[PDB]
Design an enzyme around this catalytic site. Structure first.
Site, PDB file in Angstrom:
ATOM      1  N   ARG A  65       0.890  -1.188  -0.145  1.00 53.57           N
ATOM      2  CA  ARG A  65      -0.086  -0.079  -0.002  1.00 53.57           C
ATOM      3  C   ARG A  65       0.826   1.307  -0.146  1.00 53.57           C
ATOM      4  O   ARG A  65       0.286   2.285  -0.622  1.00 53.57           O
ATOM      5  CB  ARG A  65      -1.056  -0.171   1.046  1.00 53.57           C
ATOM      6  CG  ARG A  65      -2.138  -1.004   0.874  1.00 53.57           C
ATOM      7  CD  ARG A  65      -3.408  -0.735   1.824  1.00 53.57           C
ATOM      8  NE  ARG A  65      -3.134  -1.274   3.125  1.00 53.57           N
ATOM      9  CZ  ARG A  65      -3.463  -2.499   3.629  1.00 53.57           C
ATOM     10  NH1 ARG A  65      -4.684  -3.047   3.133  1.00 53.57           N
ATOM     11  NH2 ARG A  65      -3.234  -3.105   4.964  1.00 53.57           N
ATOM     12  N   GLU A 102       8.815 -11.243   6.022  1.00 53.96           N
ATOM     13  CA  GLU A 102      10.105 -10.750   5.661  1.00 53.96           C
ATOM     14  C   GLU A 102      10.106  -9.401   4.749  1.00 53.96           C
ATOM     15  O   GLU A 102       9.251  -9.847   3.788  1.00 53.96           O
ATOM     16  CB  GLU A 102      10.982 -11.797   5.297  1.00 53.96           C
ATOM     17  CG  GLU A 102      11.428 -12.908   6.492  1.00 53.96           C
ATOM     18  CD  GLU A 102      10.036 -13.516   6.723  1.00 53.96           C
ATOM     19  OE1 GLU A 102       9.852 -14.180   7.934  1.00 53.96           O
ATOM     20  OE2 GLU A 102       9.305 -13.838   5.963  1.00 53.96           O
TER      21      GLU A 102
END
Ligand SMILES: Nc1nc2c(ncn2[C@@H]2O[C@H](COP(=O)(O)O)[C@@H](O)[C@H]2O)c(=O)[nH]1
Ligand SMILES: Nc1nc2c(ncn2[C@@H]2O[C@H](COP(=O)(O)O)[C@@H](O)[C@H]2O)c(=O)[nH]1
Lengths: 173, 176
Positions: A65, A102
């Protein structure tokens, strides 16, 4: 601030998502209203220019985002945008940090001494942004600031990022 | 075309990623060079205006690298951007569509578009066309009209273009 109002009025809040008791702040209507998106990018750019002047070299956008805002923000500032991805996505030599997800960045994304502002849509616990900062630090980049559209203040993400400064357009408990 | 050259010069190729025999086309340097990024958005916007005039209502950006181009393209055109996301991320009622990547699923909010609204879908790169095809299916299920799909790069040997037909497709750059 009428510009800020254009952004705030396009945040939509969903109770009990994804878990009971949590309120999810949906920024998607900001993207769908071009005046709202323009206002958001403008307000972020004005803050960054007023705070850092010409010191910023790159914007770093967080997957995924942050990808929505990073390039437009960079463009508004006359800067390029580098990408921090979920791990396994980037080709070539990378560094990664696990925070259990990660993050990953290409080793040649930045040179030592380059100065970066990190952008994401929302700061919650600060885990994601903290991981980004660490990754960038390992390239010997200097993180000037992290910014978001929304900050959930009761989760104290800002304190987690200290001493790196943080700025959000809007705050909710 | 000097503008197109600004984009092409910033595509990096990584052989044998993610598997041996293929070549990953990395668009990251386009984003890092603001002139390159501006050129890419401009080329896409000019094509879309020249092809659709004022008929586009929204750009639909695909998670996650389509998100890099969707909002800037939308802004250049004076339009909003709607999001098609990997399944599990969107609040509210949704529709989803699987495709082979094993399988992945894309998702859209049932309220992202109204019936009849006209949309152009953007992603960074078209390969097999599975991802773009799933996006097109979702939009069709909202009864939106998909005017075109666009990307920076198209891998022509994989025939993704045929997979989208009869929806038109346009890419800035083509590689085998
Ligand atoms: N839009 C939105 N994103 C959220 C929300 N909660 C967590 N996130 C996502 O998760 C990350 C922030 O979570 P953190 O790592 O700070 O706890 C961001 O990348 C953000 O996109 C929310 O309520 N709304
Ligand atoms: N940048 C880039 N993305 C790729 C490549 N191959 C597959 N993709 C990603 O996977 C999707 C295209 O694959 P398709 O579904 O058309 O086979 C796009 O969302 C694109 O982001 C590549 O070589 N470079």
């Amino acid at each position: 601030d009428s510009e800020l109002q254009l952004v705030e009025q396009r945040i939509r809040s969903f109770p009990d998502f994804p878990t009971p008791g949590v309120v999810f702040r949906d920024i998607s209507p900001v993207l769908k209203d071009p005046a709202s998106f323009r206002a958001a990018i403008g307000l972020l750019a004005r803050h960054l220019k007023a705070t850092h002047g010409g010191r910023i070299d790159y914007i770093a956008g967080l997957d995924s985002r942050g990808f929505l805002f990073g390039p437009s923000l960079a463009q508004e500032l006359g800067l390029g945008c580098v990408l921090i991805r979920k791990r396994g996505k980037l080709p070539g030599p990378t560094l990664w940090a696990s925070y259990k997800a990660e993050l990953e960045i290409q080793k040649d994304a930045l040179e030592p001494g380059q100065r970066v502002v990190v952008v994401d849509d929302l700061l919650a616990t600060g885990g994601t942004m903290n991981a980004a900062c660490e990754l960038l630090g390992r390239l010997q980049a200097e993180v000037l600031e992290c910014v978001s559209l929304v900050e959930l203040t009761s989760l104290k993400g800002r304190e987690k990022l200290a001493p790196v400064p943080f700025f959000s357009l809007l705050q909710y408990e």
